[PDB]
């Protein structure tokens, strides 16, 4: 598996709401911080990472770990204060924390029967 | 099939424009109205329903009907007056009616040959 | 994906010879060190890790990351000084380093044509 910009490798995600924060965690083991990039653009968060390809002159006996470009885009709802995103990378897990900023007097749709 | 929040069961959809209204219908048989929730957030409508799991102490001879959490999200175009959504549930069909509110002087892209 | 002892989750591996050392690296993100166990038994190295299941009372919106028991067994050749294995865990990567201890006067099989 070698991810490219046009066909990125995907990384698995857990996402959950923790009270007033929305949290997303990605398994992104073995990434150098120079690679990690988090782009925010209105409601959309894009995570991009790279793991370099193995030296072509190196004979691997096993080479199962995914390499190249990783990318995933999250479309967040309007109540997420994307501007206040906090990001951390530890133990090979990229964790994003976005505050939830509920609008006042939210719509509640009733269903007719 | 048991749908969860993280892996919802999906329900089939018909959607069509009827003059000045956009209509969406979902097959959602056997849902108690207490379960149905329709969330609107800017242009996105999210439909959520639950059908309870069968009593674990009940021996079913057939149990093919999907149970648990159903969810589907619709990304609507800007001309849809989502604030004026009307929703009804009858005969196991959830019907949504969204008025279409065309903007003035819409762009018409011409193609060069 | 929930790995058990009888059906462990598998983790990807790179393995290569680096001069006088054999190196194996595993992607094992988000493991607490209390979980990691490396058992050596003659020529066989077994790696075992656990990632706890999500609290059943927690509603996840996405839960793609593999959880439960991870395990992989490596059958190493006789020239690997398994007794002198060195193991490290950083950035979610479990790295094993085994010294290579070549026997004297190794057999070289010639092929008749």
């Amino acid at each position: 598996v070698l991810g490219t910009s046009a066909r990125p490798a995907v990384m698995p995600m857990d996402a959950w709401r923790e009270g007033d924060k929305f949290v997303v965690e990605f398994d992104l083991p073995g990434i150098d911080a120079d690679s990690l990039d988090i782009d925010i653009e209105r409601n959309v968060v894009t995570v991009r990472a790279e793991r370099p390809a193995v030296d072509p002159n190196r004979e691997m006996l096993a080479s199962e770990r995914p390499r190249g470009v990783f990318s995933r885009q999250l479309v967040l709802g309007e109540n997420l204060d994307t501007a206040r995103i906090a990001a951390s990378y530890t133990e090979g897990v990229l964790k994003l924390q976005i505050p939830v900023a509920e609008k006042a007097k939210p719509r509640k749709i009733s269903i007719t029967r | 099939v048991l749908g969860t929040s993280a892996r919802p069961a999906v329900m089939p959809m018909d959607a069509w424009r009827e003059g000045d209204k956009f209509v969406v219908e979902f097959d959602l048989p056997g849902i108690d109205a207490d379960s149905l929730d329709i969330d609107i957030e800017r242009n996105v409508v999210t439909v959520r329903a639950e059908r309870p799991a069968v009593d674990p102490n009940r021996e079913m001879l057939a149990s093919e009907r999907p149970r648990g959490v159903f969810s589907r999200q619709l990304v609507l175009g800007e001309n849809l007056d989502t604030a004026r959504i009307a929703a009804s549930y009858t005969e196991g069909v959830l019907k949504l009616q969204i008025p279409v509110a065309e903007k003035a002087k819409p762009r018409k892209i011409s193609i060069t040959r | 994906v929930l790995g058990t002892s009888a059906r462990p989750a598998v983790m990807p591996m790179d393995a290569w010879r680096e001069g006088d050392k054999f190196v194996v690296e595993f992607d094992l993100p988000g493991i607490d060190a209390d979980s990691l166990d490396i058992d050596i038994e003659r020529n066989v190295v077994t790696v075992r890790a656990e990632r706890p299941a999500v609290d059943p009372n927690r509603e996840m919106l996405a839960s793609e990351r593999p959880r439960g028991v991870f395990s992989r067994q490596l059958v190493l050749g006789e020239n690997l000084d398994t007794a002198r294995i060195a193991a490290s865990y950083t950035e979610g990567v479990l790295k094993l380093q085994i010294p290579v201890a070549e026997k004297a006067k190794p057999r070289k099989i010639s092929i008749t044509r």
Binding site: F22, L74, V75, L76, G77, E78 | D39, V44, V75 | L61
Partner: peptide, 5 residues
């Protein structure tokens, strides 16, 4: 905490 699948 809304997210689009």
């Amino acid at each position: 905490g809304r997210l689009l699948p």
